[PDB]
Amino acid sequence: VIDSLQLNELLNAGEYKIGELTFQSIRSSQELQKKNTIVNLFGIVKDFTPSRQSLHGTKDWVTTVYLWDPTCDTSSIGLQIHLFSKQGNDLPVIKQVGQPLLLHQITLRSYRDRTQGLSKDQFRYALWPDFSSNSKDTLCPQPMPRLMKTGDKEEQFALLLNKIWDEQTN
DNA sequence: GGTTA
């Protein structure tokens, strides 16, 4: 079982592994890159926009989230990520800021001088409750087609992320 | 693949 110190060392390495997946810390993901890359992310939802249908283009279902982790500062909102779906509205249903969110298969690219995340068509995700909340229904029912089965390792990471987020925002 | 946002 990991504690907050190990979590921080993990993140400070830029790239880190949890189970079978390799993630990129939010801060490193914010680094401006010339060429797009595909990554996995695990952070706290610092802000979000409820799912809705795009008005133009292919009109995909879309939800925006701002992901944060201990490598950014309480002052930055984090990495802006647009999650899309062309297979119905099966996007993460987020209820409040503070929820841990794990994203699998997110394209990182440059836009207006900032790195932005764009979900791959087949992206997957895991969403946790905002543990630090008094409310007990922070994690509502989620659509199934993009859900990832997770275990205790990811559970601890989520618990720690939320805790740190809370200590730094409370 | 980066329109949609």
mmCIF file of N, CA and C (backbone and C1' of nucleotides) in Angstrom, chain A residues 55 58 107 119 121, chain B:
data_model
loop_
_atom_site.group_PDB
_atom_site.id
_atom_site.type_symbol
_atom_site.label_atom_id
_atom_site.label_comp_id
_atom_site.label_asym_id
_atom_site.label_seq_id
_atom_site.Cartn_x
_atom_site.Cartn_y
_atom_site.Cartn_z
ATOM 1 N N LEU A 55 -22.552 21.083 -31.476
ATOM 2 C CA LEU A 55 -23.480 21.654 -32.445
ATOM 3 C C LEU A 55 -22.987 21.507 -33.872
ATOM 4 N N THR A 58 -18.818 16.708 -36.590
ATOM 5 C CA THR A 58 -19.486 15.421 -36.531
ATOM 6 C C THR A 58 -20.479 15.383 -35.386
ATOM 7 N N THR A 107 -5.095 11.966 -26.428
ATOM 8 C CA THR A 107 -4.110 12.614 -27.286
ATOM 9 C C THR A 107 -3.755 13.981 -26.697
ATOM 10 N N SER A 119 -9.608 13.188 -26.389
ATOM 11 C CA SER A 119 -9.770 11.753 -26.254
ATOM 12 C C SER A 119 -9.666 11.003 -27.589
ATOM 13 N N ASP A 121 -10.880 7.891 -29.952
ATOM 14 C CA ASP A 121 -12.204 7.298 -30.118
ATOM 15 C C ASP A 121 -12.535 6.196 -29.127
ATOM 16 O "O5'" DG B 1 -5.723 10.461 -37.803
ATOM 17 C "C5'" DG B 1 -6.168 11.311 -38.860
ATOM 18 C "C4'" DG B 1 -6.787 12.580 -38.323
ATOM 19 C "C3'" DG B 1 -5.806 13.567 -37.698
ATOM 20 O "O3'" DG B 1 -6.298 14.881 -37.951
ATOM 21 C "C1'" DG B 1 -7.323 12.785 -36.032
ATOM 22 P P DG B 2 -5.328 16.150 -37.816
ATOM 23 O "O5'" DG B 2 -6.217 17.144 -36.950
ATOM 24 C "C5'" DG B 2 -7.583 17.341 -37.299
ATOM 25 C "C4'" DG B 2 -8.428 17.564 -36.066
ATOM 26 C "C3'" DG B 2 -7.992 18.725 -35.177
ATOM 27 O "O3'" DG B 2 -9.148 19.503 -34.851
ATOM 28 C "C1'" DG B 2 -8.209 16.755 -33.878
ATOM 29 P P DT B 3 -9.343 20.953 -35.522
ATOM 30 O "O5'" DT B 3 -10.126 20.700 -36.883
ATOM 31 C "C5'" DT B 3 -11.133 19.718 -36.987
ATOM 32 C "C4'" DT B 3 -12.441 20.345 -37.411
ATOM 33 C "C3'" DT B 3 -13.098 21.192 -36.326
ATOM 34 O "O3'" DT B 3 -14.026 22.116 -36.924
ATOM 35 C "C1'" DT B 3 -14.219 19.106 -36.524
ATOM 36 P P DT B 4 -14.845 23.152 -35.999
ATOM 37 O "O5'" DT B 4 -15.908 22.228 -35.275
ATOM 38 C "C5'" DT B 4 -16.023 22.232 -33.876
ATOM 39 C "C4'" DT B 4 -17.096 21.262 -33.456
ATOM 40 C "C3'" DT B 4 -17.416 21.367 -31.972
ATOM 41 O "O3'" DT B 4 -18.822 21.464 -31.787
ATOM 42 C "C1'" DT B 4 -16.916 19.124 -32.523
ATOM 43 P P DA B 5 -19.391 22.616 -30.830
ATOM 44 O "O5'" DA B 5 -18.910 22.127 -29.397
ATOM 45 C "C5'" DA B 5 -18.181 22.978 -28.541
ATOM 46 C "C4'" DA B 5 -17.571 22.171 -27.421
ATOM 47 C "C3'" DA B 5 -16.911 23.048 -26.369
ATOM 48 O "O3'" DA B 5 -16.882 22.359 -25.131
ATOM 49 C "C1'" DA B 5 -15.243 21.964 -27.725
#
